[PDB]
Nucleic acid binder design. Structure first.
Lengths: 96, 102, 91, 82, 99, 79, 105, 94
DNA sequence: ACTTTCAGGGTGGTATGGCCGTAGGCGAGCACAAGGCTGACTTTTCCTCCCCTTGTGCTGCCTTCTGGGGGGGGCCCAGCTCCTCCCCATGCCAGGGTCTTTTCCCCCAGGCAGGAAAACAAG
DNA sequence: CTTGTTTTCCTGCCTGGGGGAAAAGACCCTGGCATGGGGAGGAGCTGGGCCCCCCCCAGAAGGCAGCACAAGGGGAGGAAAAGTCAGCCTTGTGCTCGCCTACGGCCATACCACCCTGAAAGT
C-alpha cells in the first residue's frame, strides 16, 4: 500500500511543527559559518554557543520566510511554493 | 529599599544601573522603584503563561518551547516581542485550512 | 562574577506558580528578556528628558517611557504597578 | 572546510524547514533559492558580529557578539545572554 | 462617433502625472477634520499646530503610497492587473503591520 | 465622520502615485481603514508626548517624535 | 583663538558637537577625537546628499534645491536609500516607475 | 525671543563649496538639519552602546569608527570612516 | 555553606526645578464667495473567473552507503585578573569670535498664452 | 498603415516672492590653570577551543513508478474606465479674541559626594 500524495506532507508538517530541535546538520552548518567568516577575517575563532545561536537565528528566520512564501503561493492560487513566492515575500518584507 | 516598597526586584541594583548606564546626568529616586516594578510585572506576566503552557503539556519545568508558545499565543505579549528570536522555542503549529485535505 | 536577575525571577515565580520549576535554559531566556526590556524603558525616558530640556530622570518620565512602549492592556497594568510602588516607597 | 560548504544545507534539511514553515509542496528551485538567501543573511549577521568582535580586540566570536549583531538588525536573540 | 480613449491610457496618464508631482492628494480641510476627530479620542480640547497637521498628512501620503505599491506587486504576482482588498491584506500581513 | 473626506478621487490619486492602473470597487474602504489605523497609531504617541510635556497643543516636534518611535522618521518639519 | 574646525579641515561644529555629546549623556567622558570624527562623518553625509540633490536639480534645469530633488537623489542612489529606507521626506513625492505588466503591448 | 541653533550655516558653506552656482530652499534647509540630527543620534547611540559593551568609560574615535562601520552600508561606511580618520589624524597631529 | 562585595543611614551643600507674574505670537472661530473638484449616470470594453486537459515535474518508496553524532584526550594560545601610574579628560573663568535675528531687493520660480509635437483610436 | 484628435511640452512674457548678502548683538569657543582617575601595559594564569581518533548507524542520495497539479487555451459576463454634466464646498482672504507658552525672578528641597557598616547574593 502507498499513501496518496499529500497526507504524508501534512504529517511531515505536523511532526516538524511540534518539534523544537535543529533541522540543519550542525557540523556542515558550522563549516558554512566558518566559510562565510573567513572572508571577513582570517584566523577567526568561534564559540559553541555562538554557532548554536547563529543556527537558531537562521532557522527561525527561514521558518518565518517560508510562512510568508506559502502565503504568497496561496495568494497565487497554488500549493507549490516557488522562487516567485520567495522573491515576493522578501521584497514586500523589505530585504530586497 | 526594595523591602520598603515591596518588590522582589532589586531597587539598589536598578538604581545603580540607571546611574551607571548613562541615561542622564541625574536620576531621581523614583525611577528605580518604578522600574523594579514594571520589570517585575512583565516577568510575572510572561511566567504565568509560560507555566500554564507547561501545565498544558503535563510538565513541571518551564522550557523555551513553553515560553515561545505562551508568548506567541498571547496577543499583547506577541505584539511587544514581535521581533524576538527565542532559541529552542520552535514555532506555533499552524496548518492553513486550504492545504488540509478535502 | 556576572550579576543577574536569576535569583529575583526565581522568587517572582514562587508567588505566581509556587509548584513548577524553571529549566536552566529558560533562566537564560528571561535574563535576556528583562535586560532587553530594561534597555528600552530607560532608553525611552532618556530621550524624553532630552526633548523636554530636563536633566533628571524621574517617575514622571518612566511612566511616559512605559506607556509609549507597552501595547494596550500591558501599559495600563505596568503603569499601575509602578505608581503603587513609588506611592508606597515615599509613604 | 573553506570551499563549497553551502551544499551542506541539504535538500532534506530545506524541506524540513519548509515543513516547519507550513509548505505543502516544494518546487525544485526552492532549494537553491533558500541556499542563496541563507548565504546572504549569514553574511550580514556574521559581518556585524566580526566588527563587534574586532572592536573588543578579541579573536573569538562569542554569544555576546552574535546577540549584539542580531539585535542591531531588529531580530533580537534571547537565551544566549544579554 | 464621439472621441473616446480605450480603458487604460487615461489611467496610465494619471499615473505619469501623479508620479511627477509632489503635492498632497488629500484635501487639507477634511484631512484636518480627520486628524482632529482622531486626536479627540486621546485628548479632549486638544489644539494642533499647522506644521503638526501638515506633518501628519505628509506621513500619511507616503504610507498609503508605499502600501499601494506593495498591493500592486501582489496583484501582479496573482496574475492580475486590478488590485484588490485581498492583495492589500496580503501585503500588510507580509510586512507585519497586522496579521 | 470625516474619513469620507478621503474621497474616491483622492484614493485613486494616491494609487496612481503608487503605480496602480486598475482599481477594484472595494479598495477605497480598505484604504480608509488602513489610513485610520496608521493615524491612530501616530497620534496616540504624539498626544502622549504632548501630555508629558504638560502642553495643550500638539507640535510638529511631537508628531516627529511619534513618527520616529514607530520607525517612520520624518524629515523637514524640524530636527 | 584657533578653531579646531579650521585646524582639522572641517566645516561642522566641532565645539558645539562636543557640547551636545557631553550634554546628550552618551558617556561619562568624551574623547578629543570623538567630535572630530563625528563632525567629519556628518559633513561627508551632508555633502553626499547635497551633491546628489544638486545633480537632480540640474537635470531639471533648476538652480534652487527643493525637497523633490533631495528625495529623487536619495531614492535613486542605492546606498542612501538603504540608509534612509524608513525615512519619510516632505514635499518630495515618489520615484517615477511603472510595472511592465500594465504597459500596453 | 530665544536663540535657536542649527547646522544651516555649515550646510550652506559646504553647499557653496560643492555646488558654487546652485542654491537651496528653506524647506531643503529644514530637511538637512533633520538629516544631520538623525544621523547624529544614530551614531551617538551606537557609540554609547559600543563603549558600554566593552565596559569603557569614554566614547573615543575608535568607538565612533565602529559605530560608523555598523551603521553605514558598503562604500558609505568605507568613505565615512576614511574621512573621519583623516580628519582626526590631521586635527590631533597639528 | 562563606564571603565579599555592595547597598543603606546620616551630613552637608547646591543646583535643578516649582510656583507666580507677564506679555505677546499664534491658534481657534466666523463670514464670503466661486471656481475647482467631486458625485451620479451611461456605454461598453476589456478584464476576471470558471472549466478542461495534459504532460510533466513532484512525491512516495527502497536500498545503499556515507558522514554526522558521540564520546575521549592533548595542548596551547587566548581571555580574564591585578597593579602602576601617566597621560587624557574635567571643573572653572576670561574674553572675543562666531553664530543668530532683522532688513532688503533682485534673481528665480509661478502663471498664462500661443504654437508645435507626440501619442491614441476608429478606419 | 493616413488622419483627425486630444493631451502634453517648449518658448516667451509678466510677476511675485522668497533666498542671499549687510548689520548688530549675545552666547558660548577656546585658551590658560589645577587635578583626579581610568585605561595602556606588563606579568600570571587557566580554560576552552581546536584538532585528531574511532565507531556506527540514522539519514541522505540516487533511481523508479505513478499521480495530481500548474499552465495553456476557451468562453462569457460583469464591473470598472472614460466622458458628461450638475452641484457643492475647499480655500484664500480678511478680521478678531483670547489663550498658552516661553521667559524671568526667587527660593525650596531632592540629589550627589562622602564616611562607615552590616547584609545580600554568587561560587
Amino acid at each position: 500500500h502507498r499513501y496518496r500524495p499529500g497526507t504524508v506532507a501534512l504529517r511531515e508538517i505536523r511532526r516538524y511543527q511540534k518539534s523544537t530541535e535543529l533541522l540543519i546538520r550542525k557540523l556542515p552548518f558550522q563549516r558554512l559559518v566558518r566559510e562565510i567568516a573567513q572572508d571577513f577575517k582570517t584566523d577567526l575563532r568561534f564559540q559553541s554557543s555562538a554557532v548554536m545561536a547563529l543556527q537558531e537565528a537562521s532557522e527561525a528566520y527561514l521558518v518565518g520566510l517560508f510562512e510568508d512564501t506559502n502565503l504568497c503561493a496561496i495568494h497565487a492560487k497554488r500549493v507549490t511554493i516557488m522562487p516567485k513566492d520567495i522573491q515576493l515575500a522578501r521584497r514586500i518584507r523589505g530585504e530586497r | 529599599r526594595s523591602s520598603r516598597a515591596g518588590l522582589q526586584f532589586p531597587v539598589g541594583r536598578v538604581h545603580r544601573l540607571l546611574r551607571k548606564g548613562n541615561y542622564a546626568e541625574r536620576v531621581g529616586a523614583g525611577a528605580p522603584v518604578y522600574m523594579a516594578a514594571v520589570l517585575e510585572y512583565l516577568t510575572a506576566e510572561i511566567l504565568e503563561l509560560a507555566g500554564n503552557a507547561a501545565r498544558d503539556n503535563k510538565k513541571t519545568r518551564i522550557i523555551p518551547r513553553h515560553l515561545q508558545l505562551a508568548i506567541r499565543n498571547d496577543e499583547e505579549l506577541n505584539k511587544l516581542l514581535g521581533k524576538v528570536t527565542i532559541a529552542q522555542g520552535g514555532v506555533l503549529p499552524n496548518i492553513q485550512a486550504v492545504l488540509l485535505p478535502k | 562574577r556576572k550579576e543577574s536577575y536569576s535569583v529575583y525571577v526565581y522568587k517572582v515565580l514562587k508567588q505566581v506558580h509556587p509548584d513548577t520549576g524553571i529549566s536552566s535554559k529558560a533562566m537564560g531566556i528571561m535574563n535576556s528578556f528583562v535586560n532587553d526590556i530594561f534597555e528600552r524603558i530607560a532608553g525611552e525616558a532618556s530621550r524624553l528628558a532630552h526633548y523636554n530640556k530636563r536633566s533628571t530622570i524621574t517617575s514622571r518620565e518612566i511612566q511616559t517611557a512605559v506607556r509609549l512602549l507597552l501595547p494596550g492592556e500591558l501599559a495600563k497594568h505596568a503603569v499601575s504597578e509602578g505608581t503603587k510602588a513609588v506611592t508606597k516607597y515615599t509613604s | 572546510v573553506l570551499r563549497d560548504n553551502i551544499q551542506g544545507i541539504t535538500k532534506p534539511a530545506i524541506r524540513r524547514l519548509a515543513r516547519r514553515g507550513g509548505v505543502k509542496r516544494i518546487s525544485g528551485l526552492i532549494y537553491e533559492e533558500t541556499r542563496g538567501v541563507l548565504k546572504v543573511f549569514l553574511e550580514n549577521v556574521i559581518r556585524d558580529a566580526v566588527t563587534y568582535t574586532e572592536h573588543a580586540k578579541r579573536k573569538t566570536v562569542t554569544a555576546m557578539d552574535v546577540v549584539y549583531a542580531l539585535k542591531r538588525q531588529g531580530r533580537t536573540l534571547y537565551g544566549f545572554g544579554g
